[PDB]
Symmetry: D3
Subunit: 251 residues, 6 copies
Amino acid sequence: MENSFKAALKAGRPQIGLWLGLSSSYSAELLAGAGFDWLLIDGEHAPNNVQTVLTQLQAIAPYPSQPVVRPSWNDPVQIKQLLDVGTQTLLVPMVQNADEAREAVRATRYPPAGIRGVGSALARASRWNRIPDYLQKANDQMCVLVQIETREAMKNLPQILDVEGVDGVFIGPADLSADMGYAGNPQHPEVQAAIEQAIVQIRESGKAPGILIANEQLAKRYLELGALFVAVGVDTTLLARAAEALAARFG
Amino acid sequence: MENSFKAALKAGRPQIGLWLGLSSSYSAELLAGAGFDWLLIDGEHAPNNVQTVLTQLQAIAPYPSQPVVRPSWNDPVQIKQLLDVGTQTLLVPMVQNADEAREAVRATRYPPAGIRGVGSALARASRWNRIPDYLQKANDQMCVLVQIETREAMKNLPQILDVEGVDGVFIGPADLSADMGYAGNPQHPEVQAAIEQAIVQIRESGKAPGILIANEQLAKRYLELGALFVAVGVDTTLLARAAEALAARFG
Amino acid sequence: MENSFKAALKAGRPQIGLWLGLSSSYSAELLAGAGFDWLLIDGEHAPNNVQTVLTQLQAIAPYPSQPVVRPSWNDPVQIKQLLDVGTQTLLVPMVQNADEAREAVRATRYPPAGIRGVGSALARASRWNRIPDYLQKANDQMCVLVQIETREAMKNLPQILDVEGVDGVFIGPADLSADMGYAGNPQHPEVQAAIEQAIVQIRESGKAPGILIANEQLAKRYLELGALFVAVGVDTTLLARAAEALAARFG
Amino acid sequence: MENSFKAALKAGRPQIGLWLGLSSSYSAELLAGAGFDWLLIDGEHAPNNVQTVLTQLQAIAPYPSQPVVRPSWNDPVQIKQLLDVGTQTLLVPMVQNADEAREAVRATRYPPAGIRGVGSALARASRWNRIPDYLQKANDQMCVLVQIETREAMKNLPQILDVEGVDGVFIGPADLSADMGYAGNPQHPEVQAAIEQAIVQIRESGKAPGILIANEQLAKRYLELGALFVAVGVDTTLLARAAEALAARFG
Amino acid sequence: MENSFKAALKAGRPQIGLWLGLSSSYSAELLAGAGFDWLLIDGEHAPNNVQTVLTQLQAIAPYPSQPVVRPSWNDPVQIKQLLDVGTQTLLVPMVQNADEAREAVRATRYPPAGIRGVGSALARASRWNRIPDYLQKANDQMCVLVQIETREAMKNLPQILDVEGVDGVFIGPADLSADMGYAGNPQHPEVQAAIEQAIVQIRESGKAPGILIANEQLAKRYLELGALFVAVGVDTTLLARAAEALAARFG
Amino acid sequence: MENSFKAALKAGRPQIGLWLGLSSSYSAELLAGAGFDWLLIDGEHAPNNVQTVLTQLQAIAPYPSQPVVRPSWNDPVQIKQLLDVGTQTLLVPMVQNADEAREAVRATRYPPAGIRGVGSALARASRWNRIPDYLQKANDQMCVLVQIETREAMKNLPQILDVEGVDGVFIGPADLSADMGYAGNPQHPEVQAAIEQAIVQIRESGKAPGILIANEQLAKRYLELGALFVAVGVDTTLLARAAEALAARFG
Ligand SMILES: O=C(O)CC[C@@H](O)CC(=O)C(=O)O
Ligand SMILES: O=C(O)CC[C@@H](O)CC(=O)C(=O)O
Ligand SMILES: O=C(O)CC[C@@H](O)CC(=O)C(=O)O
Ligand SMILES: O=C(O)CC[C@@H](O)CC(=O)C(=O)O
Ligand SMILES: O=C(O)CC[C@@H](O)CC(=O)C(=O)O
Ligand SMILES: O=C(O)CC[C@@H](O)CC(=O)C(=O)O
Ligand SMILES: [Mg+2]
Ligand SMILES: [Mg+2]
Ligand SMILES: [Mg+2]
Ligand SMILES: [Mg+2]
Ligand SMILES: [Mg+2]
Ligand SMILES: [Mg+2]
């Protein structure tokens, strides 16, 4: 049950990802064989729940691509449920300060290091108690990634980076640009500057910078600055744009 | 993506509605062709979730009847998820004061006017970014209806009506009568008086009064007093009572 | 595991029924408490399969109303699957002659009386081998009802009535009227006479006549004539018509 | 309930299509807004059934793109069920001769023109008896497309083209090439000639030629030759190839 | 709608239970016929939600085994939703003090005794208003069981036992042992002592002690000390261990 | 895409199996980790379809246990659909003679060796055209197992064994005993002799004998005799019996 995504980040190996919002175990398997290092199962902005996350994890399992799950918010109860169905890497939205980052971390760890509720007999996480000493091994294989999405979060970045258990910090350009006054449009120089400065700062602390960016030139720019988990497209977008282009070429 | 239900309320056109608690995209389509101005998809008192709301919205889409969705509570996270699958008109339960009404409104609006999280690439709401300038157009087509269900809420009605973005105020007779000490039985004169006084007061402020009432005489009475969104039946009730009556006529 | 619907037909007690086309375990429970003697789960003209039949049987189980299932056709494989999830009373469409009636009967019976495949360990039918001597008790509690829907079938009715195991014969006025050249108008005198004559002939043979008819006056006529399983309405119709009428009363 | 796809074929307007194998009502809606004239819901080679077809029809309904459904085979029972959930245009696989083409046609038509079973009260097809005179209007809006996939079928093409009710003939290059001894390589000259000759012959008979081809140059050739319903891509392929290419650009 | 599990506890009749984490209405029915007094539908540590709880309640209904439901946390909104689909006995996790116990109780009761929201027309709980005077009868048939899972909870046990409406107190050995510093391993003498002392103390107050324990010797020991609701196994464990043992016996 | 179960039979390595009738992707994963060589997903006697087979295959995929699928009957259409979602090993019920065995084999093979329809772009089988030369590699990795369940089939066994492509012959004791006049009691000497003799004859022909038997002593006897794929239990039975026994130990 070693977390290979977590190990790759710690070793400074950049991980190229794809965002999954189609909310389907079928398309999830199809995309799990496409060659990405990681796949983001979005429980915040796509119609997913614990049950559909579970089936997407099952679909993805035999492939090399590693699953990352985003809960709808920094909720210890939801986090608990996602962990028990087998989630090991979390992308937690709207983390505003060090306290909230710490809460996210503690929600993924069994006491005394955290408040994770025990239910291994019932959980896919322990393979229903087949994994020996699961309760002792689980904490170390949890990978917690926190999203900074506001000016407030940006101010607090230094303290957030000081939180043990925070393995990565993800910058969401859409929410960030909106909070900065550019209505979801990240292209503006002020937004780009904040993003790139944060990436440098995150990597400087030894933690992993992450971002979602569909512009491939910007993706490489972010990678060059030291970003370690970079999602470079979204399944819904890839499908819609390719279908639209195709239709247009035939009038 | 113009909100026609919202426009109708603002123009003082009464909207006749049906409550949907069958939690099925199939019966939802069947009822969408029955001639109602609006349909209430109940996520509070029927076994619905974001996923089943989505399929009921899809079923209803091609019909003239306009969908309204009730979340299980005034939860910004749940509200966010419902909006992204395409919800534009919300009926928010247990709004007790102006602060809570304001929170409901802000949960439906992108910054700076609100705290709505951005995820349009993934969302049916923007038709996966097919709607041009979606982020700039969305706020104005959101219609927020708040429920007053207690004596406390009734005291605070004047302040609630002062909240910008509150387009309508819905009175729930069941909860209200229970809170007033008449165990869900709204017939009592004290309950009726509170209801009718509120309706007059709501309309006086230029906002839309709403109510659910299965008694058709009371429905017309409420309409006469200026109610603008009136649900006049419930799918489960219509089905159960008609089936029971039918069976009884054959012994 | 006694088939009470079968026993009632055999004792000449008329059974009043409702047709279920909403294909939902939820509305199925709601209607199971409405007071009908039987409920028809329609696998021919509603979007059902073995799986949704199963969930509707589970929903109905604790209520007095007895379930009857209609497969999409006289198919031994499908019949086998429906029996194993617990179906004891079948309504088989488009039975044209004695050979086809005999095939329907034999599909429901274990060898040597029939060709029903054995899989009791797996099946809800035996409550997973919890019912003692299930393999010996099963055959006698199967109730086979065959549909006559064409002039050819009407002609072969005497022979169909002579098939052992055919417990009842159901007349579908819609299909019959269509075959007679009056598509969708069973009202025509020639159709009503054929129906009346069939009902009398069936009852005189010592077997149960059945029919679906939404017109309550005709239903009572057929009951007067000796029909023993009479469905007097359809769930989709009850709901649609009640809803449309309600909407109309408010313009 | 007018069949606009059928009308377009009859008027000689070419229809550009996309194949749907993702078996999801969600991705179906996403693609329904992409600008295609028609969408093929594949019940033969994708994991669909009557139920998932229904939800995909509901998702597609409000969009301009017209749905076409392929049953798993030329099965009158399955065809009956697909029609009742609202299917008006069918693509029937493995039609080998005129008799089988005639059977396909008659499965879609009410007596006396066909053997379609009557169940309008229950069916989305008539919007639950809300469409007036449905039983009289239905036959004329059915559009039957038959697949020729073997040398035997090619030989019988003249006779198949003479069957009234066969509105179009579709050539499946994959199956045809396999039958001709070039499994999975329609590129071979002998195959292309057979395809071209069939298209010309179909169009000259006054009926619509159809084909699926992912190669955009060949698609344009077949259109040049007079093909009237041409699917130019497959959803699973578009998604898989776009995703794989994206991943490859980042190594 | 009498709560027989609740009555049995009040009468001091021990109830033997099985834990359900397979999250399936099918296996739930299979196990409902296995002879247990109660069944725990786990919404905290198994992938269940309100919808799947509903279908498991439907599956279990006709059997003697009584359903108990565990929500994911002490959430009044979730509790409301579970009650309306028909839940009457709740096992509430992580109850730390008398205030939290009181909140749990009040969430299950209609005003004035609680804050339960009224929606009986829509609810399976009232059988869609078929149960006469449901609103007046419901409160008394609610059975609230609270879990004590930490040292803090243990300190507060005396006050928790003083809370009216708390019918039972459940000790979770896994969480408790973890909080005490024995990583989910309850065997340690310190854990066992706390557990047995609590059981004696709970029963002394006239309330029901409960526990889950797969060790059958420990189960009888707890019963001897006065425990009244004792779950003696878990469906996932029973299945996994039996399958593993079987496979091993054949190499 | 190599069929390891097929290779093992061919090499004479006995394969120990478990029957899956719980029809759940969740319990399927749980059991896939229990150490069996193969798992039988039953589409004949459990409520499965192509869709649930697909999800069970996805759940099982990362585990060593190899999936085998039983269609509801020897149906080329259904077989086609099962193969396209990725089924490589089939257990075909009620194969009565050599012609039917040959039909089963040809349904699994692309022309000219068979009649398998081509749809690789759409199918999980080729991982959506990601497996190179799939159309050329597929035939050889198909493994066809036929069930003999009647005296007629026993009589035709020598001819069935002569059909190329029949890799194994499975004896179902329940159905066979029923056909021989001992319904549900394979224990009878005449039945055991028929079974033993069939196993020997199958193995002597150079093909794999198979059987399901819950009695562990008989299983070992059949293995001794040369049976190569032996299912030694059923998931529903294991669960039901373990649960019932546990409940009984507490009275
Ligand atoms: O492109 C989108 O709108 C969908 C994904 C975002 O919500 C990802 C995110 O967290 C962010 O960058 O704000
Ligand atoms: O009639 C019912 O009980 C169902 C709907 C209510 O919850 C609607 C509501 O909000 C209220 O009037 O309290
Ligand atoms: O009223 C309808 O058309 C719907 C149900 C029929 O399929 C009933 C039937 O079997 C028949 O009357 O032919
Ligand atoms: O491209 C593929 O192989 C997938 C779709 C086919 O089934 C289309 C078809 O009907 C044919 O070309 O034989
Ligand atoms: O055995 C398990 O881990 C599954 C069930 C527990 O979460 C039950 C519980 O509440 C407890 O004893 O901590
Ligand atoms: O034990 C049972 O009856 C359930 C499984 C059978 O269908 C297995 C089978 O194929 C046979 O033995 O006839
Ligand atoms: Mg964001
Ligand atoms: Mg209310
Ligand atoms: Mg009929
Ligand atoms: Mg083809
Ligand atoms: Mg616990
Ligand atoms: Mg068998």
